């Protein structure tokens, strides 16, 4: 149910743990395309939402 680009849905992440191993090491479809973040240290540094 991926909405169209004219109107999408916002996904707000509550209090939980961010694990990005399933994104990088598991199913590496295409480029990581990190904007400003350490791909090895994605989880070692964390944000609010």
């Amino acid at each position, epitope marked *: *149910r991926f909405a169209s680009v004219y109107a999408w849905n916002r*996904k707000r992440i509550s209090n939980c743990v961010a694990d990005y191993s399933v994104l990088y090491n598991f199913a590496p479809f295409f480029a990581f395309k990190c904007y400003g973040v350490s791909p090895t240290k994605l989880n070692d540094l964390c944000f609010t939402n």
Partner: antibody
Amino acid sequence: QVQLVQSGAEVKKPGASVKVSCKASGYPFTSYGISWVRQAPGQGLEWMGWISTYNGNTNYAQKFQGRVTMTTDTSTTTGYMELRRLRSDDTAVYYCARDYTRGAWFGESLIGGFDNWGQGTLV
Amino acid sequence: EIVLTQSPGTLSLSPGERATLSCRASQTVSSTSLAWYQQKPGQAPRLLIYGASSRATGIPDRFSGSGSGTDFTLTISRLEPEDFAVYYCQQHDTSLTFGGGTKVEIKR
């Protein structure tokens, strides 16, 4: 690694409520909901139960809408049914499963299937 | 709801040969609305394919998927004699419906 354990066989008279439990372990009990299916010999399965873990969103089947009520507990990560409106010839097996089709937080249309099943109980 | 038109009534063929499982939809389903499962006598169902053709539980050389658009098909090559598993196919667009069931006998 994942362990789904369940109680033994039970027989419940008609008109009562059968309590069925399934303890889940071995997987993080926050990223997946708890689904519940029924099976009888000579036929496939159904879509009778689903309750999430983060929230209590209800997505039961319309065929038995308002007939199934159940709880999920994070203390032991156990699913409990207090199934009512019991019938004599509903001695069909009930299976707990990990929902990888319904979103456990928002309710997305997750591509995939119920990759895991419990050991089963007899009612 | 939308049910899947299934007619693998009885795949009474010798193990190790080509096996075809039909899961034609009713009118129209998305290509990524598929799920194939196996069940054995005296054994709980196990998942086989969670998507179009990706492997979910092992699948060394037997289970494969083909099709395009709406129609899709399951293919088995070099079937292991012991399994004789009853196959189920489930969609994703309209709620969740299972297959009727495919019975396979000994074929001595």
